[PDB]
Paper text:
For bc1 complex (complex III) assembly, the iron–sulfur protein Rip1 must first be imported into the mitochondrial matrix to fold and acquire its 2Fe–2S cluster, then translocated and inserted into the inner mitochondrial membrane (IM). This translocation of folded Rip1 is accomplished by Bcs1, an unusual heptameric AAA ATPase that couples ATP hydrolysis to translocation. Here, contrary to most AAA-ATPases that form hexameric rings with rather narrow central pores, Bcs1 was shown to form heptameric rings with a significantly wider pore and two large vestibules. One protomer consists of three domains, a transmembrane helix (TMH) at the N-terminus, a Bcs1-specific β-sheet-containing middle domain and a C-terminal AAA cassette.
Numbering used by the authors:
A (entry chain E): 84 to 136
B (entry chain D): 84 to 160, 167 to 324, 339 to 453
C (entry chain E): 191 to 324, 339 to 350
D (entry chain C): 244 to 324, 339 to 403
The structure:
Amino acid sequence: IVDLEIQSKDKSYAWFLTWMAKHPQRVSRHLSVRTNYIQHDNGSVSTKFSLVP
Amino acid sequence: IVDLEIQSKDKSYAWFLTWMAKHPQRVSRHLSVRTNYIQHDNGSVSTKFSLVPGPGNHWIRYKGAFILIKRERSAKMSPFETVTLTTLYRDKHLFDDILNEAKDIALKTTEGKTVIYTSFGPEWRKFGQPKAKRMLPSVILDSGIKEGILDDVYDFMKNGKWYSDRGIPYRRGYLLYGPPGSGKTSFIQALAGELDYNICILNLSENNLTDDRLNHLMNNMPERSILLLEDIDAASVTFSGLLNALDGVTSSEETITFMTTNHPEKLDAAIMRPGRIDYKVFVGNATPYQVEKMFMKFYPGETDICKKFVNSVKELDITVSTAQLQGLFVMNKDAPHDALKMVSSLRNAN
Amino acid sequence: AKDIALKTTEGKTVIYTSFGPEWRKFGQPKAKRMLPSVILDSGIKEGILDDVYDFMKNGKWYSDRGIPYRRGYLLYGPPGSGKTSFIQALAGELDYNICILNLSENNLTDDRLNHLMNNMPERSILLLEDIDAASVTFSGLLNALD
Amino acid sequence: DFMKNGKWYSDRGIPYRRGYLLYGPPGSGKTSFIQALAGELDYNICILNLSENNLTDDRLNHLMNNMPERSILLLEDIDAASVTFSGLLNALDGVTSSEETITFMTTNHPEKLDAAIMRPGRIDYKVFVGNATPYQVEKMFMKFYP
Ligand SMILES: Nc1ncnc2c1ncn2[C@@H]1O[C@H](COP(=O)(O)OP(=O)(O)OP(O)(O)=S)[C@@H](O)[C@H]1O
Ligand SMILES: Nc1ncnc2c1ncn2[C@@H]1O[C@H](COP(=O)(O)OP(=O)(O)OP(O)(O)=S)[C@@H](O)[C@H]1O
Ligand SMILES: Nc1ncnc2c1ncn2[C@@H]1O[C@H](COP(=O)(O)OP(=O)(O)OP(O)(O)=S)[C@@H](O)[C@H]1O
């Protein structure tokens, strides 16, 4: 009675990860931290922390 | 009712272990040892044993949530390494505060020390213990050279928006060319100390380095740092790849890069284009202004012996270097008369 | 997911770098360089822009005559003249990405190069900086280009 | 004089580090004097072979930084030289160079060395350990036949 799609290191895999990160309905009890630069013209560039699933 | 958060080998990782070492309200078993090269002014009695949380599980309180840390390694040990946090109240908002505090602790530059980063694979790594800041008045360059470089650097750092309004990439490159022992590397240390910036020393003659790794290193420098390319004329990197790394679509933004050479003519005109090397200044052999100021630095106070010394140097008609002058003043510590007697020794070079 | 990842930010261009047999984003997106900021000679910018727009508009005309729908541009000149700057400006104008490819990279093979040139992201420009610099073979590069 | 004046170097910002070169014909007592002086100072000897192939620049910087305390760095046959020339030069005097180390170098061919390595911030003291002089002959005879 269930279905299951798998996609593995595909060009849509990174797209799916980015979409999942942007999802507001996500309820994820597991998080990962990866630093990212927030480049803004005012002042100087700074790093930022992203809580990906 | 729990929410776990992990982070692999990234920039946030080492910041987090440095923060967790300093955290007071910590209940850690399973600790580890770490010898380090601490220093006292008279002499560095190194090998101070430091106890770090190490692998295993740890309890920290922080703001009142009783977070469980879990450091563990895998099949290998810097491969296969990770820490893990767990909060028991769905208070994941504390994780970003933890990360920000770790970032602030790590980014906090020691008030009189300069940090040196070295290319280790595709990312930078701290090299040794931080070295004491070299002061700008110690470096005796020719008249207007130090001031000209400092004015150009401050003008570049201040005018950030001006670059972006006109579309010019916010990036400046400096070349110090001249004879050996003229003050180039010493001036790099002094200027990095003045700006309170770190130094990322990069060796292109490293055979393991490649173009993709070079671009990653140039684009992942730690904040508030200066890229140093010692002996840019020495050059698995490719010439076109280096040229694009210096100025190209792949080149990074908001970086100061410094390169030094003893053979400027060995450089191609492409690398010396005024968009890759914007400022080039000749750090030459010692001039009488340099001789006088070097003597006054090593022997403060009396000037008549300094006058006799610079006259004798002028009569010696030899292209002395400031490294040679420093060596002579080091030989005669606190003895200006002995230095004036031994000034003739600068003539010999074998 | 495709729409989110394919949408371009309003004022930045993505840069792709050849990592193995496929492309990947390099760093953060860089702000678009504006075409008026690139001072080329008279008619040069306008001529190149007209030729590019004429090529992108006439997709069907190429197919009807049987010509392969593919164009190649060479900007040659002295160092520091505007070549790379114009590439950035034009890619920003078209809202295309730049796929930088280094042929002098030793791990690159002919099969890998064909796969890279046949798997570029949609709406992107292939940039071969210093084509004169050249594990790739001459015949393999020639057949890959046309 | 160098070991005593630790603070004097720090006051003027000079890196606390000295380099010595003994050059001359073979069998003049260079290595023997290194052993004697290390025994006198009660220091260890760290002998480093630059010609060893698996040594790289990063490894050499780590070795020259992580020397055991109260030891002498010995570079026998400096003229013999996977290490790079620039990497060696920056290791001996550069931003990456360590602090409070005595380094001793020997060679039978001093003229084979570049100006950069013979710089008086890399090699501070250079003395010619030559063939036997009549004073040396007399003192050797007195040592062997008191
Ligand atoms: N102008 C100067 N003022 C003060 N100290 C100097 C000066 N020039 C050289 N020195 C000292 O001499 C040594 C070598 O100087 P560096 O600047 O480190 O080397 P360099 O001048 O860059 O030459 P290289 O071999 O090309 S790195 C250091 O111990 C410096 O403290
Ligand atoms: N025509 C131009 N108009 C405006 N800025 C220019 C122009 N040509 C060069 N520049 C600036 O000069 C620098 C380098 O220009 P590039 O176009 O990257 O160099 P180039 O012409 O590609 O030559 P190379 O060395 O072969 S990459 C950048 O800071 C540009 O902004
Ligand atoms: N001046 C000397 N005084 C005492 N013994 C000496 C002297 N010169 C040589 N010898 C003896 O001969 C050996 C050779 O001297 P070393 O210093 O070891 O070699 P060397 O002088 O460095 O020559 P090389 O071949 O360049 S290592 C020593 O181990 C002593 O046994």
